[PDB]
Amino acid sequence: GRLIYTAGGYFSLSYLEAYNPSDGTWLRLADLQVPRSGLAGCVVGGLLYAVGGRNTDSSALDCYNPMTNQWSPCAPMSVPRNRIGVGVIDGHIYAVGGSHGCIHHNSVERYEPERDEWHLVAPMLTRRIGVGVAVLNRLLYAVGGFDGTNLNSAECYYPENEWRMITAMNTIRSGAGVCVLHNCIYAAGGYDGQDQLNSVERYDVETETWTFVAPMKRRSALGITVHQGRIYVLGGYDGHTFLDSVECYDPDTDTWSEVTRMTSGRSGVGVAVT
Numbered sequence: 001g002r003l004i005y006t007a008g009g010y011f012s013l014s015y016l017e018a019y020n021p022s023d024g025t026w027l028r029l030a031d032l033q034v035p036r037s038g039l040a041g042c043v044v045g046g047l048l049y050a051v052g053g054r055n056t057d058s059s060a061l062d063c064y065n066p067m068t069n070q071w072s073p074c075a076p077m078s079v080p081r082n083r084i085g086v087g088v089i090d091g092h093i094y095a096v097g098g099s100h101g102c103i104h105h106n107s108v109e110r111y112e113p114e115r116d117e118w119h120l121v122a123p124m125l126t127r128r129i130g131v132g133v134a135v136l137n138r139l140l141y142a143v144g145g146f147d148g149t150n151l152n153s154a155e156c157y158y159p160e161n162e163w164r165m166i167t168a169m170n171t172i173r174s175g176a177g178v179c180v181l182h183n184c185i186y187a188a189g190g191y192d193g194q195d196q197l198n199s200v201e202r203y204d205v206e207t208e209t210w211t212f213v214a215p216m217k218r219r220s221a222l223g224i225t226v227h228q229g230r231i232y233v234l235g236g237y238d239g240h241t242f243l244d245s246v247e248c249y250d251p252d253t254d255t256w257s258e259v260t261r262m263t264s265g266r267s268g269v270g271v272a273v274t
């Protein structure tokens, strides 16, 4: 009965809408206190947090509670982080990368909801604005992005405080939807400098290889989450228009299938499931 929340986005949007893949119903919920695009979403203990983005870049961390349909302010990050990416480990929110104006972040900071406190951790090997982030059994991955100059590179964070480069992708991707499904890390979509991508690669943590799976039906700044063993990508920008298209990836048949449409097109959204 879990839901897919899309929060904020760009058409900078305040919408918080929830999709049920089991019946095609959308619900519109309480707005983001402050519109934001370029933000990330993630869930801790049933709570949905919206991080970073921009309205002016944003350091805001807000918390949405399905049980109250109310957005609660949290302590802000140590710096603004637009085009951020986030992951959770042990109930802690890791916010990696992003940009504050011309400052392209390689720093990473961790929020403990228990104390409402943000705290710095070991920065990355590379500045990554538009970074993709996912976590696989307490390893945090930052994938792609753009360092202020040039990334196919990916790197991995072990919490117990050092980042390690991993195998590079087959593709240069900033603004790529990144997730973990099963024991693999997916990097769907992105922007290679030239084109929006519809291709998707997954890193098998156990063969340390990026292999392409079927292409999507193109997009950047797309939302991405998992729901009932399936990847859902939301909206994004295909180079010409801001898509309302929501696409679902079934790993069993290795196909991407459009599965719904958002009530309005957006990119720059934060997405999570709870």
Ligand SMILES: NC(=O)CN1c2ccc(c3ccccc23)N(CC(N)=O)S(=O)(=O)c2cccc(c2)OC(=O)CCCCC(=O)N2CCC[C@H]2C(=O)Nc2ccc(cc2)S1(=O)=O
Binding pocket: 009, 010, 037, 038, 039, 053, 054, 082, 083, 084, 129, 130, 131, 145, 146, 174, 175, 176, 190, 191, 220, 221, 237, 239, 267, 268, 269
């Ligand atoms: N919160 C934000 O900062 C804003 N948003 C973001 C914008 C960017 C990245 C974002 C990545 C992650 C999350 C959010 C991203 N990326 C760079 C990165 N290092 O990751 S990106 O994914 O690679 C990418 C997306 C879209 C366009 C693009 C590159 O550049 C291009 O293709 C140029 C092609 C022609 C379009 C164009 O001329 N335009 C002139 C200005 C903008 C863009 C525009 O007209 N409308 C627009 C408005 C809002 C958004 C996208 C497009 S947004 O809200 O999603």
